Design a protein around this ligand. Structure first.
Ligand SMILES: Cc1cc2nc3c(=O)[nH]c(=O)nc-3n(C[C@H](O)[C@H](O)[C@H](O)COP(=O)(O)OP(=O)(O)OC[C@H]3O[C@@H](n4cnc5c(N)ncnc54)[C@H](O)[C@@H]3O)c2cc1C
Ligand SMILES: Cc1cc2nc3c(=O)[nH]c(=O)nc-3n(C[C@H](O)[C@H](O)[C@H](O)COP(=O)(O)OP(=O)(O)OC[C@H]3O[C@@H](n4cnc5c(N)ncnc54)[C@H](O)[C@@H]3O)c2cc1C
Ligand SMILES: Nc1ncnc2c1ncn2[C@@H]1O[C@H](COP(=O)(O)OP(=O)(O)O)[C@@H](O)[C@H]1OP(=O)(O)O
Lengths: 575, 578
């Protein structure tokens, strides 16, 4: 048989053995499953198809064993499961076909797709409060404390710059400095978040998915114990588990950090204008937040350890820095050594943090202080998986708390899967979680060979001036292929919308196309610094799925007038 | 066998007079002896049989034996003997002042001029702007720069910034309360100051790049001679080995009494010394709706009179959606055509006039004449080629029924050393980026001997209506007409741009996208359509999908950028069933 026949057979059949040619331990398998009154269906895989099948399930020798549509590997893996007693518990009936731990981007996407394929699904979501005590509804990081509130506050900051544009285009706006009222913005954002929480809660109920607002821990091979807000503990059993627990803001081992500094978990529901703010960190979260806080008129400082946007093209990173500097954000090469609280916040006004730094001159080191209203700790995001009981169900984790996959299947446990941010090496983006969820569900319950494509994923950093990208940085391309084999085509431009204004952005917009010279200027990556970078980058990202060349960009006809057409017309080679 | 295409075209670019023949060759000693008459060497090439059909397709001729003159494809012997017998060949083979004369200083003309001169050729560019009926005139850059896309997009942005002022309030910006008016004079000066900078830019760019600019209207007075007249009425003579016609079009006026006296055009709208006030837009083209749209957005009372359908050529589903939205935004649409325009007041000193517009309306008894008073009437019923006074008869360049030049690609079908690009080229889509690409590419064929062709299919557009409409490829109707309803899948969704989520905008109920797919070829994408803020920025990249025969599966395995409107193309599942 071919692949799809094998995977379909595997999805449908309760226990399937996939073989190339007659091997001794197939009898041993028959005899072992005979022990449990189980019937072992078999398939002669054709030799034309072995390699493909082996690559898809991510195992390296041929004889393959499936249990309830989950790939276990070979005999050693099976005998391990049997010897551990797991197989005996696995073969029993359970309450749910699938239990999902996490009600975020991935969780909810998986839940919706599973139930559309007619499976009994439970979804567990619980939000342990931040250190400041902040908590929120269903939907996960993106909905409550991630992309959706951040984009709204970015739009607030842009509408600031639009008010001034409106004057240059002839709109007679009554004279007077205009201030943004934090309470109005925050209520407007929180009201939308509240509508999405209800939306998801409804969507789950409407689709016959069981929701439990309860924090889940493995207390058995196929048993989660789940604790709700009241402290009530229930037991949930299932034939399969999806871990989509995501991450939480990282705090450093520094005195006062956890006492004095807020995180993105807290910023989007603050009962006060955060005032003179310090953003600690160089991640996209620090710069996005610093950006909009400046745009709504706060005094903003960013303290970075060494470089901005580690992982991103450093040319583009330096360009974001020059621009946000021109827009009045202060950058400083420090890491605080202590945070001291001077004033607690009220329900209407912010507090005061004293921030301690070591500063050098040519004569020695000074301990130096500086008083900020609010300090945003934004250095990263970690997996909080210590209290999940992954030891109980023998799910290996990386040094960080992230789960180690064979694709999305736990590398060590065949009926536990992970997607989204907690999957070791998964890019931490909402649309990736969703696609991983939707696609996994289609492999598990449909027996398709469809794989989430984790390469050449487009991003946008929503800095005051937006940065869109897909593919290699100029550095990575040069490191992997030589300098001699890379062409960079690039250009500056002025968005027409800015032409009649005196905006600082007129001197900062830039795009570059990274091309492999010795393979017909094949496009390895592209990068653009512009209004609406995300709207522009999305479509152009499909070019990389087809091994597009520069010639393909040059024979594409522009829409005039747009920023996007600039990618149609590049001729200048960087050095 | 013998030579392949690029060797032939390279040989043709380099050699003064080339004869390209197949394994098989006809009389073509007569031709040799003909060019021997002119002290010429006739270089020859055995084209390989592997290459004949390609080469024939590229130059757009049907028989094998091919003759080239000064890097121009003439056809076969009949065409050559015709040129000889007409005396043209004798004049062609002489030296001329310029390698190339370009008639038109617009999108195509200037693009061609820059590309020719980069390939080290002596080029003259001629541009003159005959005033509108109201007397309006403008500088270098053509329609786009002065009276087309550049001023239009700025006035659109003015209209959007209107809706942004209100958004700013819902996001918490404390804007002092009280109606906000847009001051027409400020907007118009801001636009005209930008146009002035582009005018200057282009004029300088030409001087810096060693291109001769003459602000003179050009007419063919010889096989290889333009006579050109400047503003002062001074007439000069310009000769060249080749000519590029990039004359563009001008607004159409109807044979209706008072139309030309009373109604402005886009030629006049962008420099009006007055707020146009209560406006009538006559026409259903993108020009009428774009202008009606921004005039509404800056707070004018706007009416659109359409003969029959909006945006003929465009997807009528999307057209009806634009109508419903612009209706919700206060634009009045009427199925009427004026039968007379009567001027009541002239525009004087920073104020508009009053036009009385006459219509036939039926009531419960029959048809009556009805009048209605508008401040300004924008005649926007299309654009025509004004090629009657160009002397194309003199150089025997065939024109279509409209004034447009008939091409064998961009070569005049009838004269081998005259070429046309942009709006005046019969069947060329009328867009700035097409003109530019046609110009740049032609120049690379003519002076480099490359086989590169401008790609005139699957061209993305955006209509900059109050809510922007972006598209590429077939409409739902065209796809159904060509393939059949049983073989078409239409995937579609509504969505709310996050930027609108906390507002009470009308647009929240109107944003829509659809993907038109050929069911029996793995949902191959024939077209896509989106109604959204920033439709142009979204459509551009997605348009490259159609250069690779993208399937729906390609859109589904593309990972979205969240949150953007664009990602909606990544997660379409709903099938339209009417
Ligand atoms: C400030 C910020 C801005 C961002 N901006 C963007 C952006 O613009 N675009 C973009 O694509 N991505 C963005 N991201 C990333 C995006 O939010 C994540 O990639 C995405 O939310 C990951 O979703 P997930 O399903 O993996 O996890 P989450 O959304 O974190 O879902 C996990 C859920 O599981 C719950 N949970 C944890 N443990 C348990 C347990 N034991 N039992 C039950 N429930 C549990 C958690 O409380 C949480 O609700 C941003 C992230 C942040 C923090
Ligand atoms: C209101 C409006 C909005 C538009 N919006 C868009 C849009 O958003 N996007 C887009 O892609 N396209 C748009 N277009 C179309 C675009 O302007 C044209 O497609 C483009 O300008 C055509 O370029 P061209 O070189 O063919 O002609 P033109 O730009 O018209 O250039 C012709 C020039 O030659 C001059 N000329 C004419 N005859 C002679 C002669 N005998 N001797 C010398 N000079 C002569 C003309 O006066 C003119 O200066 C718009 C058009 C209009 C009218
Ligand atoms: N004399 C006239 N009076 C009123 N409307 C007219 C007109 N001539 C053209 N139009 C309209 O003005 C627009 C532009 O004319 P066009 O000839 O450039 O359009 P098309 O793209 O159909 O070739 C069309 O909406 C057209 O309506 P019809 O499609 O019914 O012709």
């Amino acid at each position: 048989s071919l692949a799809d026949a094998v995977f379909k057979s595997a999805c449908e059949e309760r226990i399937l053995l996939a073989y190339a040619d007659y091997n001794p331990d197939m009898t041993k398998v028959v005899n072992l499953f005979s022990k449990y009154n189980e019937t072992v269906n078999t398939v002669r895989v054709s030799n034309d198809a072995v390699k493909d099948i082996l690559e898809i399930v991510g195992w390296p020798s041929m004889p393959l064993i499936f249990v309830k549509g989950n790939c276990c590997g070979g005999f050693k893996e099976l005998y391990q499961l049997e010897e551990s007693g797991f197989l005996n518990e696995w073969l029993k009936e359970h309450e749910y076909d699938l239990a999902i731990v996490g009600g975020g981007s991935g969780g909810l996407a998986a839940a919706k797709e599973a139930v559309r394929l007619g499976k009994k699904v439970v979804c567990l979501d619980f939000v342990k409060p931040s250190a400041m005590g902040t908590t929120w509804g269903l939907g996960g990081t993106c909905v409550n404390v991630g992309c959706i509130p951040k984009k709204l506050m970015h739009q607030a900051a842009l509408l600031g710059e639009y008010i001034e544009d409106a004057k240059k285009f002839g709109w007679e706006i009554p004279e007077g400095a205009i201030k943004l009222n934090w309470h109005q913005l925050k209520n407007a954002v929180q009201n939308h978040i509240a509508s999405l929480n209800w939306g998801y809660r409804v969507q789950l109920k409407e689709k016959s998915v069981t929701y439990m607002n309860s924090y889940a821990t493995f207390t058995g091979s196929h048993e989660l114990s789940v604790k709700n807000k009241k402290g009530k503990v229930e037991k949930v059993t299932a034939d399969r588990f999806l871990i989509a627990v995501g991450l939480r803001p990282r705090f450093p081992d520094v005195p006062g950090a956890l006492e004095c500094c807020i995180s993105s978990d807290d910023l989007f529901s603050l009962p006060y204008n955060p005032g003179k703010t310090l953003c600690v960190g160089a991640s996209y979260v620090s710069l996005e937040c610093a950006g909009f806080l400046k745009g709504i008129g706060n005094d903003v400082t960013v303290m970075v350890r060494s470089v901005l946007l580690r992982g991103f093209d450093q040319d583009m990173a330096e360009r974001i820095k020059k621009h946000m500097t021109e827009r009045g954000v202060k950058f400083v090469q420090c890491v605080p050594i202590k945070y001291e609280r001077l004033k607690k916040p009220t329900d209407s006004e912010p507090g005061m943090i004293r921030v301690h730094t070591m500063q050098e001159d040519e004569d020695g080191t000074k301990e130096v202080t500086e008083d900020f209203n609010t300090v945003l700790m934004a250095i990263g995001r970690d997996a909080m998986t210590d209290d999940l009981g992954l030891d109980v169900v023998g799910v290996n984790r990386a040094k960080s708390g992230k789960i180690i996959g064979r694709r999305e299947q736990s590398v060590s446990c065949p009926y536990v899967y992970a997607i989204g941010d907690v999957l070791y090496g998964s890019p931490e983006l909402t649309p990736v979680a969703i696609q991983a969820g939707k696609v996994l569900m289609r492999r598990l319950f449909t027996g398709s060979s469809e794989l989430t494509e984790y390469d050449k994923i487009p991003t946008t950093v929503f800095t005051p001036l937006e940065y869109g990208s897909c593919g290699l940085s100029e550095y990575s391309a040069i490191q992997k292929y030589g300098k001699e084999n890379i062409n960079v085509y690039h250009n500056v431009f002025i968005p027409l919308e800015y032409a009649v204004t005196e905006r600082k952005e007129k001197t900062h917009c830039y795009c570059k196309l990274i091309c492999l010279k010795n393979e017909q200027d094949l496009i390895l990556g592209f990068h653009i610094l512009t209004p609406n970078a995300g709207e522009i980058t999305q479509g152009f990202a499909i070019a990389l799925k087809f091994d597009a060349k520069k010639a393909d960009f040059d024979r594409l006809i522009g829409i005039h007038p747009t920023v996007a057409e600039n990618f149609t017309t590049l001729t200048l080679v960087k050095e």
